Curated annotation (Swiss-Prot):
This is Endo-1,4-beta-xylanase. SMART domains: Glyco_10 (SM00633). Keywords: Carbohydrate metabolism, Disulfide bond, Glycosidase, Hydrolase, Polysaccharide degradation, Pyrrolidone carboxylic acid, Signal, Xylan degradation. It is an enzyme of class 3 (hydrolase). GO terms for biological process: xylan catabolic process.
C-alpha cells in the first residue's frame, strides 16, 4: 500500500472515487486487499458478476464469487460498480442458442432483475449494457440485437431501473478515447436519442484501455461523451500499455476537467495480474510497489 491514497486525493478534488477491478482470487493473495483498503475507494468485479459466472444454467444462479466481493466491499467501505448485465462475450451457450424474441427478452429481463435485486441498494452503479457498438458506430450484431432487435437496449435499462432505482445505470464501451473516432460520436448521439425517448441511461462508461500516447486524446473525448447529457460519465477500466505517467495523468485531468465525471476505475492492481500483463499497464509492479504512474497521479491530485 502507498502512503498517499489516490482515492482520498481525488475525493478531495471533488470526485466520488478512484477504484480498481478485483475479485476473490485477488483479495485472497498478495498485498491486494491491503492496497485496495488503503488506496482505492471503489471496486468492480473483474469476472464474478458476469453472465457466464452468475447463471451458467438458466434459472440456476451462482453468486459465490459475486457475494464474496460485495461482502468484502461493504465490510471495507468500498463503493461497488456491478459488471456486467448484458454483454455478448462470456455468454453461456444456453442463451446464444435462443432464437425466439419473447424467450430471449424474458431471459434477459430475469437475468438483470435477479442480479440487481440480490444486491439492491448496495451497488452505486451497474454496467447494464456492455460493448453494444461496432467501431463504425452502428449497433453490434449480437444475439440480443438479432433476436430482440434494437429495443433490447431500452428494455434492459427500463428493467434495471425497476429492479433497483438506487443504482446509476451505465452503458459501457471501449475505444471512446478519441473525439474524432466514429464510435465516440455515435454513442453520444444514440444515448442522446435514447434519453430523449425516456430510456434511463444515467451514465456512459469509457473503458479507456489505452496504448502508449493515447492519453492526450481523452482530454477531448471525455468532454464529448459528457455532451450526451447523461448525469454521469466515468473512466471504467483504465490501463495503459507502457504505464507512462503522461498517459495516466492526462486521463486523470480529463476526468477532473469534466464536471459529470464521477470517478476512475483502473483495471487491476499489480501488473502480473493485469489481463494485459505483457504490457505492464497498471499502477503497481510485480513487487506490488507503486509505479512512477501512481506517484504521478498523486502529485497531480495534491
Amino acid at each position: 500500500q502507498a502512503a498517499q491514497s489516490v482515492d482520498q486525493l481525488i475525493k478531495a478534488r471533488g470526485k466520488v472515487y478512484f477504484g480498481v477491478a478485483t475479485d476473490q482470487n485477488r483479495l485472497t493473495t498478495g498485498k491486494n486487499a491491503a492496497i485496495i483498503q488503503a488506496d482505492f475507494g471503489q471496486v468492480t468485479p473483474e469476472n464474478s458478476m458476469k453472465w457466464d459466472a452468475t447463471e451458467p444454467s438458466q434459472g440456476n444462479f451462482n453468486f459465490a464469487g459475486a457475494d464474496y466481493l460485495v461482502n468484502w466491499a461493504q465490510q471495507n467501505g468500498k463503493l461497488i460498480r456491478g459488471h456486467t448485465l448484458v454483454w455478448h462475450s462470456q455468454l453461456p451457450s444456453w442463451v446464444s442458442s435462443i432464437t425466439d424474441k419473447n424467450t430471449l427478452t424474458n431471459v434477459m429481463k430475469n437475468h438483470i432483475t435477479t442480479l440487481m435485486t440480490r444486491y439492491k441498494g448496495k451497488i452505486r452503479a451497474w454496467d447494464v449494457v456492455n460493448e453494444a457498438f461496432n467501431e463504425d458506430g452502428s449497433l453490434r450484431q449480437t444475439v440480443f440485437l438479432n433476436v430482440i432487435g434494437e429495443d433490447y437496449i431500452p428494455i434492459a435499462f427500463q428493467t434495471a431501473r425497476a429492479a433497483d432505482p438506487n443504482a446509476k445505470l451505465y452503458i459501457n464501451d471501449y475505444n471512446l478515447d478519441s473525439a474524432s473516432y466514429p464510435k465516440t460520436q455515435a454513442i453520444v448521439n444514440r444515448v442522446k436519442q435514447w434519453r430523449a425517448a425516456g430510456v434511463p441511461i444515467d451514465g456512459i462508461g469509457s473503458q479507456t484501455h489505452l496504448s502508449a500516447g493515447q492519453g492526450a486524446g481523452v482530454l477531448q473525448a471525455l468532454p464529448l461523451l459528457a455532451s450526451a447529457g447523461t448525469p454521469e460519465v466515468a473512466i471504467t477500466e483504465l490501463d495503459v500499455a507502457g504505464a507512462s505517467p503522461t498517459d495516466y495523468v492526462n486521463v486523470v485531468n480529463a476526468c477532473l476537467n469534466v464536471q459529470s465525471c464521477v470517478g476512475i476505475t483502473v483495471w487491476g492492481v499489480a501488473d502480473p495480474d493485469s489481463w494485459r500483463a505483457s504490457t505492464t499497464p497498471l499502477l503497481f509492479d510485480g513487487n506490488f510497489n507503486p509505479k512512477p504512474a501512481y506517484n504521478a497521479i498523486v502529485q497531480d491530485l495534491q
